[PDB]
Design a protein around this ligand. Structure first.
Ligand SMILES: N[C@@H](CCCC[NH3+])C(=O)O
Ligand SMILES: CC(C)[C@H](N)C(=O)O
Ligand SMILES: [Ca+2]
Ligand SMILES: [Ca+2]
Ligand SMILES: [Ca+2]
Ligand SMILES: [Ca+2]
Ligand SMILES: [Zn+2]
Length: 316
């Protein structure tokens, strides 16, 4: 909508106060004009018609319980935009400052979040498996990263290409979490998963097997569930990315860590220059090796570590 840019204040899902960029025209709307062609947050009103209504508020204060998922979806979309712009020189998900749209309060008891081809969508959770999923910066950045992938490599959401697609979203979700630097880790969704259980998460990149996901290609799932295991076999790539950044010895293979920033540069270049819709894990290895070669040189430690990491997870 047309209006003047304003700064509201509210509380997110976890009770933390933050400022939000809003737009004033009779009401104050969750429309951030400071980033690209805007970040817009919508109320789906417990239904499944999308996007719903652009979030409107009478006083620019967002402290009601119902406001909290919208505050975080809006704010963390901004963080994610900033990460891609500041770190990778990428303007929104399409590289041309496309408007970023999110809807919250999707359906009832909805234990998930997704990118629907056009926008991000967040359930509130059922209060036991999840609380409202926009409370997780890694979840928000995971979903927006699907938009990036969809515009760039276009990895088909099935089998190995789909597991790469998922791992890319977990990788950049995690790198965005570190960029914001609140309580960062290599786990996925810990801030919104199982409020009654401390210390767990939906997936682990440092130890995928903690939640039954494979950490080596020999353990890959080959059935048909979950689009051929896209959220399962992502563990193999997540583990490789974790090893590239942090190092370690995994099934006897030692990897020299090179840190998160270089992990991000290598995988962003692979995503945007080398991967294609049909890429498999072997092709991801080659794309990552080539990306590291481009950035750091063929004789670099960075290239050697990429090779070590894919060796360690059984990807040749
Ligand atoms: N996002 C993953 C895990 C969440 C499961 C919650 N229902 C999936 O859709 O499979
Ligand atoms: C819950 C979120 C991280 C995603 N839709 C799965 O995985
Ligand atoms: Ca208000
Ligand atoms: Ca965390
Ligand atoms: Ca996390
Ligand atoms: Ca928990
Ligand atoms: Zn995903």
């Amino acid at each position: 909508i047309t209006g003047t840019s304003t700064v509201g204040v509210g509380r997110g899902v976890l009770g933390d106060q933050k400022n939000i960029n809003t737009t004033y025209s009779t009401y104050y709307y969750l429309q951030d004009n400071t980033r690209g062609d805007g970040i817009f947050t919508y109320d789906a009103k417990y239904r499944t018609t999308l996007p719903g209504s652009l979030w409107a508020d009478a006083d620019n204060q967002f402290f009601a319980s119902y406001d909290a998922p919208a505050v975080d979806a809006h704010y963390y979309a901004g963080v994610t935009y900033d990460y891609y712009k500041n770190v990778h020189n990428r303007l929104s998900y399409d590289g041309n400052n496309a408007a970023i749209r999110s809807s919250v309060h999707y359906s009832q008891g909805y234990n998930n979040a997704f990118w629907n081809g056009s926008e991000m969508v967040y359930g509130d959770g059922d209060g036991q498996t999840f609380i409202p999923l926009s409370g997780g910066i890694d979840v928000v950045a995971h979903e927006l990263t699907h938009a990036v992938t969809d515009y760039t490599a276009g990895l088909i959401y099935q089998n190995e290409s789909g597991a790469i697609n998922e791992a890319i979203s977990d990788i950049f979700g995690t790198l965005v979490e570190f960029y914001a630097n609140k309580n960062p880790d290599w786990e996925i969704g810990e801030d919104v998963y199982t409020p009654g259980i401390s210390g767990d998460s939906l997936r682990s990149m440092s130890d995928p097997a903690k939640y039954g996901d494979p950490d080596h290609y020999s353990k890959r799932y080959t059935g048909t569930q979950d689009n051929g295991g896209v959220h399962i076999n992502s563990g193999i790539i997540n583990k490789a990315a974790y090893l590239i950044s942090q190092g370690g010895t995994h099934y006897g293979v030692s990897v020299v860590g090179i840190g998160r920033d270089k992990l991000g540069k290598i995988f962003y270049r692979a995503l945007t220059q080398y991967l294609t819709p049909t890429s498999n894990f072997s092709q991801l290895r080659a794309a990552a090796v080539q990306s590291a070669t481009d950035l750091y040189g063929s004789t670099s430690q960075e290239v050697a570590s990429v090779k070590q990491a894919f060796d360690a997870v059984g990807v040749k």
